[PDB]
């Protein structure tokens, strides 16, 4: 009861997928194989974790996931990897044949020969709920199955369970790990035809994780090793209330409430803290006052922006570990006279605080120290729609010359769905000025 | 004068009943509206879609 | 005029419930098992009007649990007395309302409220006299707050003629769970002015204040908020469940306490203030003291238009009239010159860990700041349409919000009137 079903589309989000379900085993005491030896209730029952793991007789704990990308050699990974024996066969669904880079191929031209068998996939898992809350679907933007397949996807997962929760983790583009130049076209067109399909999405940046990876792990040269690492940590920090039981443990609904003024208004902002090499965390503890500043440094946000220069309509913080209530409440005192948090004249200022009691967990080979405390910060902020002012900009420079528009019309798309979904980004940069602007 | 009393009794609460019968009415329309709009949207997406 | 039923919706409702059926069942000698092995006849005389026999000379509550998710009350049912309540009055859906309430009025609450209406008609059915209803909700979730006022008016609808009494846990940003507690407050105000006879303010403003500036905790739990409530609840139902003459059922204590419909919502009080021994003249000092209201309204800013005071333990009954005369003569002012003899004082000769105490209740013009407060906070949202679309995605229109608003902006103004009057 309270399933949640992950949908992990293209190469992005199914690798991000392979880290969370790796971290979840940890956190949970699930092995390689399935096997949870504290779990004494054989093949089935409603703890926390069977939100997100269901059990078959034989005492295998089986990710509520589906994984599917139009070509196989990300998932022929996880057939053949650690986790092989995590996921039946069902779950990991491949194509021949990728997007190449364009969203008309993920949504159109390849997308629909899979789309009917991935529906039916997903159908599986939740015909086993006994109470499915919704979706969380980890994609790409810039990628064409993570930008196209995953547009398709959402359209139909609205047809066929109306208004589930569909809750989006995107992988926002940055040039120093990017592999097109129609990244920003990708954007704009699966933004466009998501938007009125997601109740919620949390934008990860790749420039953002990756400097955080050079600046606070001494990485040289981050790959998507070292990115994914990081994103499974602000990933389950998010879903952690939906995992575990606790009496201080508020559920991520009841943080949606609070994150979602408007529809369209649903892009919070997350903040991690610490992010430590095991070198620098030896003999340093970090308390929960200094956890809590953090993360109102810039340098720790998933996506690069300015806060200082927005306004706030929501502060969440999610604690996990060794931290209680007085630490936190003396922490929020001590930062509300030093900062610039400044709320519109229409929200409450009051930080809504959770407490999950289990500590972090870190990946053997992994670049974190293991901490005692940890925290993220959900913001809803006006300062987010930078990030859409980025991507707009560099979408009109191309635009403007229709560089490379050639490639979508051969696939059947039309300059009108450009243009549209151009004038619905204008229209989101225009509701975020609105929202921030003070009440007559 | 009893009886009188007794039908004024009885109009108060007939008033009461009426009352509470159009707030029952409205909670019949609420929920029908909510099941309109998600048919209308599912309709929608589907049509768009198509 | 005998039978009682209780209800507690939601989360707030059943926890709250849940500490008031532990601290009366103690007062009354019933242990976990619903036997009864305590001292005095007096525990025993009007026990039928909150709890009824079973088989082997067993007390049972007089208690329906509701809930629209099942966690709060599977920890009742592990709680201390948690085996006491009859099993089939547990009545609990699995979707939860999401501090919504138009899910809990409209959507989720209108699926579940015939079922719980089965169970208050079974109660209601083998009750010699039912007086009436009492229901623990808190005003700020989905539950407690939607389901709970559509409770009300289907209670309503089949038992017009019965009393209908509330204690509404009323919301505070200090103590808060969601932004939208103001939107949902201000929805279920609107059915409480229509639809109860009494109302019990239980501000969270003031028991968070109570617990940091009397008690000295630096953080306030829910648990510490809870140990004022249920005190408090156990002091303002002595009347009702122990022998005596004053305000001894609900009836009589709306007739002296409720001058016209609509201003029934009372500021309760309590002293002394606990987490050795205490006089008569410190007992009405301190429950009367703006810092022991469990609403955190100034009464100095209003007026009394009726008080009833209950003293627990033994003491003078003589230093008792003269001290309750004493604060009425000396303080003439704030109690409404036009309804004479407005405070009743009750004495109870059975103490709650104390050896004694004092309960207040008043009608006090100045609970318009507790409604003013919550209007604010609703005003400032709604004229930017913000966190709507949760209400409207079940199916409400904003004109719904508009006539809620108003409402309690007319109850402010009718508090106003009485006061300058
Ligand atoms: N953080 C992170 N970003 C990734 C990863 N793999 C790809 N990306 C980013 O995702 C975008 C490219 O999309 P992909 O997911 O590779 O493409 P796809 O969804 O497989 O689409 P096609 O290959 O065109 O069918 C770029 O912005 C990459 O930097 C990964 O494992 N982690
Ligand atoms: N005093 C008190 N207030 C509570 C308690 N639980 C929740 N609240 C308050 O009740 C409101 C939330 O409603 P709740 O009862 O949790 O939601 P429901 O289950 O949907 O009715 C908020 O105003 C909280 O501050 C409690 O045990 N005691
Ligand atoms: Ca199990
Ligand atoms: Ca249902
Ligand atoms: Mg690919
Ligand atoms: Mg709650």
């Known amino acids: 009861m309270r399933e949640c079903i992950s949908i992990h589309v293209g190469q992005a989000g199914v690798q991000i997928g392979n880290a969370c379900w790796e971290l979840y085993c940890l956190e949970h005491g699930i092995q390689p194989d399935g096997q949870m030896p504290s779990d004494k209730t054989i093949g089935g029952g409603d703890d926390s974790f069977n939100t997100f793991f ?101 359209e139909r997962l609205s047809v066929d369970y109306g208004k589930k929760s569909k809750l989006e983790f995107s992988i926002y583009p940055a040039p120093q790990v990017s592999t097109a130049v129609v990244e920003p076209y990708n954007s704009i067109l699966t933004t466009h035809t998501t938007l009125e399909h997601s109740d919620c999405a949390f934008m990860v940046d790749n420039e953002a994780i990756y400097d955080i990876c050079r600046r606070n792990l001494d990485i040289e040269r981050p790959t998507y090793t070292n990115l ?92 996990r570990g ?53 925290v993220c910060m959900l913001s809803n902020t006006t300062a987010i729609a930078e990030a859409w002012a980025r991507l707009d900009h560099k979408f009109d420079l191309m635009y403007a010359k229709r560089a490379f528009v050639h490639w979508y019309v051969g696939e059947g798309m039309e300059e009108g769905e450009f243009s549209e979904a151009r004038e619905d980004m204008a229209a989101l940069e225009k509701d975020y000025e609105e929202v921030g602007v003070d009440s007559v | 004068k009893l009886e009188a009393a007794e039908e004024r009794r009885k109009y108060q609460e007939a008033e009461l009943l009426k009352h509470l019968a159009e707030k029952r009415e409205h909670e019949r329309e609420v929920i029908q509206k909510a099941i309109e709009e998600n048919n209308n949207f599912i309709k929608m997406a589907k049509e768009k879609l198509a | ?72 009350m599977d920890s009742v049912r592990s709680g201390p007395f948690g085996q006491i309540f009859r099993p089939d009055n547990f009545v609990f859906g699995q979707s939860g309302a999401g501090n919504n309430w138009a899910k809990g009025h409209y959507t989720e609450g209108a699926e579940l ?85 009494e109302t019990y303010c239980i501000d969270n403003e003031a028991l968070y204040d109570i617990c940091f500036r009397t008690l000295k905790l630096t953080t306030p739990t829910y648990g510490d908020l809870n ?45 002394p203030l606990t987490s050795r021994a205490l006089t008569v003249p410190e007992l009405t000092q301190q429950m009367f003291d703006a810092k022991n209201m469990m609403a955190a ?40 010159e036009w309804i004479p003899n407005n405070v009743k004082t009750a004495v109870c000769d059975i103490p709650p860990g104390l050896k004694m105490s004092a309960t207040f209740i008043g009608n006090s013009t100045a609970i318009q700041e507790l409604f003013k407060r919550i209007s604010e906070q609703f005003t400032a949202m709604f004229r930017r349409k913000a966190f709507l679309h949760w209400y409207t995605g079940e199916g409400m229109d904003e004109m719904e919000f508009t006539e809620a608003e108003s409402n309690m902006n007319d109850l402010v103004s009718e508090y106003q009137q009485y006061q300058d009057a």
């Open chain 1, 54 to 154: 269901s059990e078959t007789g034989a005492g295998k704990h089986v990710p509520r996931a589906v994984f599917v990308d139009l070509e196989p050699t990300v998932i022929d990974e996880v057939r053949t990897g650690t986790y092989r024996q995590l996921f039946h066969p069902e779950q990991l669904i491949t194509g021949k044949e990728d997007a190449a880079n364009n969203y008309a191929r993920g949504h159109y031209t390849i997308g629909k020969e899979i789309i009917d068998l991935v529906l039916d996939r997903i159908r599986k898992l939740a015909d086993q709920c006994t109470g499915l809350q919704g979706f969380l679907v980890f994609h790409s933007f810039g990628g064409g199955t993570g930008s196209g397949f995953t547009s398709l996807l959402m």
């Open chain 1, 228 to 319: 994914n690492r990081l994103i499974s940590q602000i990933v389950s920090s998010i879903t952690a209330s939906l995992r575990f039981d606790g009496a201080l443990n508020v559920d991520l609904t009841e943080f949606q409430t609070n994150l979602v003024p408007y529809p369209r208004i649903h892009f919070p902002l997350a903040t991690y803290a610490p992010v430590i090499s095991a070198e620098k965390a030896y003999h340093e503890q970090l308390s929960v006052a200094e956890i809590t500043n953090a993360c109102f440094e810039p340098a720790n946000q998933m996506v690069k922006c300015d806060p200082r220069h927005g306004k706030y309509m929501a502060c969440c913080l999610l604690y």
């Open chain 1, 322 to 374: 060794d931290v209680v209530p007085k630490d936190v409440n003396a922490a929020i005192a001590t930062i509300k006279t030093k900062r610039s948090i400044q709320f519109v004249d229409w929200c409450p200022t009051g930080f809504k605080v959770g407490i999950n009691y289990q500590p972090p967990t870190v990946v053997p080979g992994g670049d974190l120290a293991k901490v005692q405390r940890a």
């Open chain 3, 1 to 72: 005029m005998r039978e009682i039923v209780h209800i507690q919706a939601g989360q707030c409702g059943n926890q709250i419930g849940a500490k008031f059926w532990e601290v009366i069942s103690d007062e009354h000698g019933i242990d976990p098992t619903g036997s009864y092995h305590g001292d005095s006849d007096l525990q025993l005389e009007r026990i039928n009007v909150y709890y009824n026999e079973a088989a082997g000379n067993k007390y049972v509550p007089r208690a329906i649990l509701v809930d629209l998710e099942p966690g709060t």
């Open chain 3, 113 to 197: 409220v015939d079922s719980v209406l089965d169970v208050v008609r079974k109660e209601s059915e083998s009750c010699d006299c039912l007086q009436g209803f009492q229901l623990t909700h808190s005003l700020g979730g989905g539950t407690g707050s939607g389901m709970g006022t559509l409770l009300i008016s289907k209670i309503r609808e089949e038992y017009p003629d019965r009393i209908m009494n509330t204690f509404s846990v009323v919301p505070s940003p200090k103590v808060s769970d969601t932004v939208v507690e103001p939107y949902n407050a201000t929805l279920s105000v609107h059915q409480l002015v229509e639809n109860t006879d």
């Open chain 3, 227 to 271: 140990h004022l409530v249920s005190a408090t609840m156990s002091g303002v139902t002595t009347c009702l469940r122990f022998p005596g003459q004053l305000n001894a059922d609900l009836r009589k204590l709306a007739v002296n306490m409720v001058p016209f419909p609509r201003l029934h919502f009372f500021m309760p009080g309590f002293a």
């Open chain 3, 297 to 336: 309204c100034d009464p100095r800013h209003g007026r009394y238009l009726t008080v009833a005071a209950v003293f627990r333990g033994r003491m003078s009954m003589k230093e008792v009239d003269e001290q309750m005369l004493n604060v009425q003569n000396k303080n003439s002012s704030y109690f409404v």
